[PDB]
């Protein structure tokens, strides 16, 4: 009988954990043309838009995070605890219960309500921008999502830098490991983050506000979740809301620095902003791989059998360059009215909780920056994030206008 899965015989191979690998290489394009799904050593990789969108919702595929933790063999400890218990690792009743307590402030209706704050914050950040060369992350891409999360979670607004610094230094992008050197840094960062969070939580336990930390504390007083679930959930929302938005904002500037004519088009027509943001999400999603799933049962799709326990990764970046769906897919173009959205936010039960908030922050940022400033220009060497997950500039030296 068969030595390998018969339906896997023709699947193109890709190794995204290879120093020379690029999502935009011709070999990746060839793979997507040959097959809707590629084989990697440890996981199947979905490359075409239709299947990536559909399978992220497929109930036969649950969260693969716990599978990955066992795959990398993280030892028993605080880092493993967080990685196996946090929202993205859960499914069924536990997931819907915990996600449910964090949903309210992120619903489209409630995002409308925070819009005035976002616009005012963007305006203020632009008012005090430096006038020569400067780090865009330091002066805009970091402050904006840090302040927004502080506002939503009930943290003092002057704590925005500390909160941002705390999120970065958890090094959660490096947590999928069994190396002790890395795991020391991750644990130390998580501990310091929990120090701030527990202090905020204990304060809301006695004097609650209308913020999300206060909301979750009330659920804790109603016995819906325990103390550990409480702090883990707050930590989850904070980290997931900060780094992604930060890097995506920095990628937006990078995209327009490479294509400044399109910046002038938004200045000419501010109405282009939402479409422009969606193009940034299509062209350069901060999470090239969005949904990390695992087969919960044996099933078949397009004649390819996916047995129980198969890790399945949704490759948003490659799916965004699918010419079956997007016209002139490998060209950055904000002017094209597109039928299909980006799938930068994944899908299914785990679909990004702050999707509407993310689009708001990006749209408000882009619209105001383009209306008030000249096109961005790269002003020095960029420091890129070299990790699995969040991608984009950690530091972006630039100037708005040649003079
Ligand atoms: C401040 C705004 C944001 C907030 C509050 C937020 C929050 C969250 C949370 C709590 C989760 C876990 C959901 C779950 O497991 O049930 C999540 C997942 C996710 N987020 Fe975000 N996020 C934000 C911005 C972004 C941005 C800018 C991107 C990239 C474009 C992004 C991409 C994703 C993806 C791809 C997932 C996984 C979805 C899946 O597995 O199907 N998020 N987010």
Curated annotation (Swiss-Prot):
Heme b binds at residues 95, 99, 293, 347, 350, 352. PROSITE patterns: CYTOCHROME_P450. Its EC number is 1.14.15.37. GO terms for biological process: antibiotic biosynthetic process. It catalyses: luteothin + 4 reduced [2Fe-2S]-[ferredoxin] + 2 O2 + 4 H(+) = aureothin + 4 oxidized [2Fe-2S]-[ferredoxin] + 3 H2O. Changing residue 236 to F: Exhibits a change in regioselectivity and is capable of C-9a hydroxylation. Transmembrane segments: none annotated. It comes from the Bacteria. Keywords: Antibiotic biosynthesis, Heme, Iron, Metal-binding, Monooxygenase, Oxidoreductase. Its cofactor is heme b. Belongs to the cytochrome P450 family. Bifunctional cytochrome P450 protein involved in the biosynthesis of the antibiotic aureothin, a nitroaryl polyketide metabolite with antifungal, cytotoxic and insecticidal activities. Catalyzes the hydroxylation of luteothin (also called deoxyaureothin), leading to the formation of the intermediate (7R)-7-hydroxydeoxyaureothin, followed by the formation of the aureothin tetrahydrofuran ring, the final step in the biosynthesis of aureothin. This is Luteothin monooxygenase.
């Amino acid at each position: 009988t068969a030595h390998t899965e018969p339906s896997w015989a023709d699947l193109p191979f890709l190794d995204f954990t290879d120093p020379n690998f690029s999502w935009d290489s011709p070999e990746v394009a060839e793979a997507r043309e040959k097959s809707w799904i590629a084989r990697t050593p440890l996981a199947l990789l979905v490359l075409r838009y239709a299947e990536a969108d559909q399978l992220a919702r497929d109930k036969r595929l649950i969260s693969g995070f716990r599978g990955l933790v066992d795959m990398v063999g993280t030892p028993e400890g605080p880092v493993r605890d967080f990685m196996v218990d946090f929202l993205q690792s859960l499914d069924g009743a536990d997931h819907r219960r915990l996600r449910g307590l964090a949903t309210h402030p992120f619903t489209p209706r409630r995002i409308t309500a925070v819009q005035p704050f976002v616009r005012s914050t963007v305006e203020q950040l632009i008012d005090k921008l430096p006038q020569g060369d400067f780090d865009f992350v330091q002066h805009f891409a970091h402050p904006l999502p840090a302040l927004v999360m502080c506002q939503l979670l009930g943290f003092p607004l002057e704590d925005y830098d500390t909160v941002g610094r705390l999120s970065i230094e958890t090094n959660l992008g490096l947590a999928l490991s069994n190396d002790q050197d890395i795991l020391v840094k991750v644990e130390q960062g998580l501990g310091r983050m929990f120090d701030y969070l527990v202090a905020a939580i204990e304060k809301r336990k006695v004097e609650p506000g209308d913020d999300l930390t206060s909301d979750i504390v009330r659920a804790f007083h109603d016995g819906v979740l325990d103390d550990y679930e409480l702090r883990t959930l707050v930590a989850t929302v904070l980290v997931a809301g900060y780094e992604t938005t930060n890097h995506q904002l920095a990628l937006a500037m990078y995209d327009f620095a490479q294509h400044p004519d399109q910046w002038m088009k938004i200045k000419e027509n501010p109405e282009l902003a939402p479409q422009a943001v969606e193009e940034v999400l299509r062209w350069s999603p901060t999470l090239p791989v969005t949904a990390t799933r695992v087969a919960a049962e044996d099933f078949e799709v397009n004649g390819v059998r996916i047995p129980t326990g198969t890790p399945v990764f949704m490759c948003a970046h490659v799916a965004h360059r699918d010419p079956r769906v997007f016209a002139d897919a490998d060209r950055f173009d904000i002017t094209v009215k597109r039928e299909a959205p980006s799938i930068a936010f994944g899908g299914g039960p785990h679909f990004c909780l702050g999707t509407a908030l993310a689009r708001l922050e990006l749209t408000e940022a882009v619209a105001a920056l383009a209306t008030r400033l000249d096109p961005p220009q790269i002003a020095g060497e960029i420091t890129w994030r070299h990790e699995l997950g969040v991608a984009g500039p950690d530091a972006l030296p630039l100037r708005f206008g040649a003079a």
